[PDB]
Design a protein around this ligand. Sequence first.
Ligand SMILES: Cc1cc2nc3c(=O)[nH]c(=O)nc-3n(C[C@H](O)[C@H](O)[C@H](O)COP(=O)(O)OP(=O)(O)OC[C@H]3O[C@@H](n4cnc5c(N)ncnc54)[C@H](O)[C@@H]3O)c2cc1C
Ligand SMILES: Cc1cc2nc3c(=O)[nH]c(=O)nc-3n(C[C@H](O)[C@H](O)[C@H](O)COP(=O)(O)OP(=O)(O)OC[C@H]3O[C@@H](n4cnc5c(N)ncnc54)[C@H](O)[C@@H]3O)c2cc1C
Ligand SMILES: COCC(=O)NCc1ccccc1
Ligand SMILES: COCC(=O)NCc1ccccc1
Ligand SMILES: COCC(=O)NCc1ccccc1
Ligand SMILES: COCC(=O)NCc1ccccc1
Lengths: 587, 588
Amino acid sequence: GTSQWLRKTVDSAAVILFSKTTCPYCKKVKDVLAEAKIKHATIELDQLSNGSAIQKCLASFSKIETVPQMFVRGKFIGDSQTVLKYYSNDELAGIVNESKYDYDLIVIGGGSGGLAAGKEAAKYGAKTAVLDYVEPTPIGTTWGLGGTCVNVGCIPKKLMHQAGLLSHALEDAEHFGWSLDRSKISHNWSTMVEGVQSHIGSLNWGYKVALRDNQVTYLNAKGRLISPHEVQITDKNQKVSTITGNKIILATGERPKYPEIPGAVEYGITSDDLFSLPYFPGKTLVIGASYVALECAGFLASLGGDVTVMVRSILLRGFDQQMAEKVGDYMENHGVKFAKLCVPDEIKQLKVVDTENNKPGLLLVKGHYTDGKKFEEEFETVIFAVGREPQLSKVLCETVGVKLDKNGRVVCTDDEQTTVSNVYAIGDINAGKPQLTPVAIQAGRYLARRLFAGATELTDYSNVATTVFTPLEYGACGLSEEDAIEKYGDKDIEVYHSNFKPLEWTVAHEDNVCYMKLVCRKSDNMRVLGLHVLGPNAGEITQGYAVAIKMGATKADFDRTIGIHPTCSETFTTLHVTKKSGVSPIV
Amino acid sequence: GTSQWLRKTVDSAAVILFSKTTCPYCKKVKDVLAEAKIKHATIELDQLSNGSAIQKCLASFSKIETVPQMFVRGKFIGDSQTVLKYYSNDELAGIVNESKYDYDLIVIGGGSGGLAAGKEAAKYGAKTAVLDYVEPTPIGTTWGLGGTCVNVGCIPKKLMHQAGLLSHALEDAEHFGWSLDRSKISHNWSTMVEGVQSHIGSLNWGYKVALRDNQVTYLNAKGRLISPHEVQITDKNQKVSTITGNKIILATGERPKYPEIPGAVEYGITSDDLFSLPYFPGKTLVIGASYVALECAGFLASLGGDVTVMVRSILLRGFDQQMAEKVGDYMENHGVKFAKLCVPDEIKQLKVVDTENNKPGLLLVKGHYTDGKKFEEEFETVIFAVGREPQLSKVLCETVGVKLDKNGRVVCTDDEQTTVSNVYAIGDINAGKPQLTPVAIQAGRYLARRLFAGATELTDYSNVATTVFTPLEYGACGLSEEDAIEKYGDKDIEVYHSNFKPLEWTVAHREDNVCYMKLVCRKSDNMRVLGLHVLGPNAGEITQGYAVAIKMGATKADFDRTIGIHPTCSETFTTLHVTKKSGVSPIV
Ligand SMILES: Cc1cc2nc3c(=O)[nH]c(=O)nc-3n(C[C@H](O)[C@H](O)[C@H](O)COP(=O)(O)OP(=O)(O)OC[C@H]3O[C@@H](n4cnc5c(N)ncnc54)[C@H](O)[C@@H]3O)c2cc1C
Ligand SMILES: Cc1cc2nc3c(=O)[nH]c(=O)nc-3n(C[C@H](O)[C@H](O)[C@H](O)COP(=O)(O)OP(=O)(O)OC[C@H]3O[C@@H](n4cnc5c(N)ncnc54)[C@H](O)[C@@H]3O)c2cc1C
Ligand SMILES: COCC(=O)NCc1ccccc1
Ligand SMILES: COCC(=O)NCc1ccccc1
Ligand SMILES: COCC(=O)NCc1ccccc1
Ligand SMILES: COCC(=O)NCc1ccccc1
């Protein structure tokens, strides 16, 4: 009912005003709170369909049914006369700061989700702390505020992908009439890294500025939850102390795994080290087959590197395997070598990294194939991309009572609540959720609004679109073909597909490598279950269709919509060849 | 209802079989027709909701109610035993080819719409002819099969746009670590024209191959409709003759306009000439302010040219004007000069075009500003982009009875039918329709299916998305902000907007707050998205997908609950929150 919503909202909000837009008494109270620099949530009752019933329920706390009514941390404070009495008697600031705890909210983790949750909470008057610490990699690499995406993830990865894309831009320019000679142009790794790191630095600073301008307390400290409301923090100087908070948000993310083989930790690196590496990696082996592995190998090859990928079984496990194979075939034809069906056994050091002259070392990699033959080859750099994992045993004392799953991620309700009722988890550590930066940001902002502004909207985790930024990009939204066939049966699935050629590729001189498909359910009006595209700018192509899939688009919706010409994306609006027909999809 | 549909379908279809998927007698008839290379439409009665009623109405034509039933040009031909008799007796070929007319379908015009209509019709057994002729420009330019888009429109202009985009890619490469020096690289116009024209030639050839492989008769001839079923054709040798057809599709498109001033036709050019010009235009004046004018001026400046645009009043009349101004401001900041509020009065010739040394001429342009002050400046090339118009007085004898509107376009019903019942019109000459290549293609294909395969689906001309390929691209779908406010009033319209910066622009040191997007929404209809607008790179790829959601009636809530893809430009549409009425700044 309305009544129990109102109780949760009053119990949880830090400072909240129940108001009406046309009442000059509420306006007087608003302008008072603004002058006093008091931030607060506002619930305009004349804009809610059942505002009348809420007014009646307020009296259960305040014994009045009029507006405005101000509350602070679950307690009714007063109407217009009473609030102005406190203001003119210099008693207001003390009353709005009265709290059982040091903070209304403590966020452990200053990354994609945690910074978004903390900033949104502060907008409603929640007194908020954000804790962030970066544990250094085995070789000592560290970085600033903002999380995995900002520092060692989406941002530097896509900037180095762009540096690689520009190599083919240089090649194409000749065919379009420009006088340069591609074969006499080379790439400088450290010039690239300096520009990438300068941009990352501007983001570290921007987040510190944003927290200060929202009155958020930023602590560069390692946090550990030792009881439901107590966080122990450890300083850069090993000073230990305890702060208290009403609500706690866990948002500490993951770090790369290493295989348990000799030499891995000592002599290899991960993506954590790659994006600030002060020397060109040289001849490189990438071990693994995830989107991180393939994206990194792809741009290293495009910058002119000698690059090999060691694949245990398949590419992109969990993605549509037809598409995954097309991705890998393109890379193999464009200068990435693959050691297929192969695992490593040991990494042996032949030459130590020369920090002084800014040169890599030299390594001997020993491994074996599934047919039993041995692998043995020398590389200057070895990069492990074999998955990521959280380390919540560092963050969470067992006695607090927060349940984890077999993988060590937090088990949450559909509103991010843990098994401890004031403790929530968002981002990559929330078990079962897509591990993506815009998912973490939406979860964090929406959760802050439910805690401190009386919102009810949940985050929707279904049909979240993705893009893999390999040399030829792969965008997807919804089910793979194999998952749909498993779920519904082969006779209830129809697949429309086509090759295509970007117009930009005609003058630049391949005809049939770009490819797209719609996987559809026959018995549900040909509903689009999944969309897949391999081609340039695949993330821009895919994004808009994710809205239509969210709304339940059918094939007839795609047919009746008209294309924009000339584009790659328009090919989705005229698809007609089915896989069951056996007709070729080539252009 | 059903009976009126069945009569229209039987009267119009060239060759059609009424069938069921489970009937082995129907399968035997299908096999005979395929072996005799007889193409036909097929309607599978067991797959239609009212298949039982259709089966019963068939008796009004054939006096039977079973399947299969074969018809040819409105006449019942027979059941399974009868079709096999004709086949065994070598009588079937002559039956299926019997006609009052030379062709089931004559398409006048071999462009985007006409080629699509003709190929689709031939798939259902319609005996089809496609007529195409290119009247040369005043200086003599002509080109091959395929229409305006293929030869002198979307295809060459986007390729030249891409050559222009690559100049900034060469600049950006230095910041991302590559060793080149952009300052020492120049552009060769004729090398780019040769590559563009080689691709256009492959399209000309590909369409001739497609018509041959579909058994469509291609006539390189100028057509004139002289009665409802008679088309007069004129040869390249000026031989005149008459062919007849049951259905007629008019698909002749438009050509560029010239202003009525001295020297315009003699010494200027249009887009028709630009895309195959053998020499670089040099210092260029573009007169006009359409998307054609701005796209051409944009790429010429990026290829190193000294370019001025003469604007009579505003940019992009009929497009959202906040967006049009941001487009123009970006071009003016990046090396396009504008002569604002200005029109030309005369072009004088100072040098003839130098065909020997492959060089432009030289012209003196005189004009005046709206306050009366004078304009006078020299240019090597003057391009007119002041609109396009059809020439239907050449295509259509007045006595046929096809009604035209005040602009000379064809007045059609919602199924493309003109005021003459067997005559239809598609593409740019269809009055009131968006003038775009994918619209012409959808209209031609859907019409051919209704004429020859019993389809009922109409083309939907509402909320068709567009993209202007200026140096910074502008994509749009739906109403402009000013049209939304005019239609619903200011109090019922909410606008969400934001600047943004492509991630690719950060290390390249490009501008922070020039790219821009907005959603124009209707408050009283669950915040329905009435219009979407984006200025930024790859704007056509950004916009296309959202056109499906707008077709389905997307609201602001649907954008909010959808999660973004990171890092992209398009994801900024999923988190918009600043409203124009709040007064809050949209900068990042
Ligand atoms: C190479 C790579 C590329 C990626 N590319 C993309 C992409 O293109 N698009 C996309 O959507 N996603 C991408 N991702 C995923 C994206 O980075 C993550 O989903 C996102 O960063 C998760 O956000 P988060 O808030 O859960 O955690 P994080 O961003 O990892 O932030 C958690 C923070 O908490 C800190 N912390 C940990 N323990 C403590 C403690 N005890 N006390 C204090 N602070 C602590 C961590 O050091 C870190 O700073 C990529 C990931 C990688 C590794
Ligand atoms: C510079 C420019 C750029 C454009 N860019 C785009 C773009 O990016 N995207 C987009 O969607 N649209 C674009 N367009 C619009 C697009 O070209 C048209 O909407 C489309 O070509 C219209 O097709 P149509 O079939 O109506 O006519 P057309 O393609 O013009 O074909 C008509 C054909 O009929 C021929 N013909 C004329 N009279 C006769 C006759 N009597 N007998 C026989 N044949 C005859 C003509 O010579 C021509 O070949 C652009 C147009 C221009 C001018
Ligand atoms: C960059 O995209 C990485 C990602 O994790 N995308 C979502 C996904 C979920 C489940 C299986 C495959 C993919
Ligand atoms: C079933 O997968 C067999 C396999 O060897 N996959 C690895 C790979 C495939 C295609 C291109 C590059 C690498
Ligand atoms: C009302 O419009 C007045 C006008 O002069 N528009 C032309 C123009 C505007 C912005 C940049 C370049 C040209
Ligand atoms: C009001 O204009 C609507 C329209 O669709 N105009 C045709 C066109 C649009 C965009 C780019 C090029 C051409």
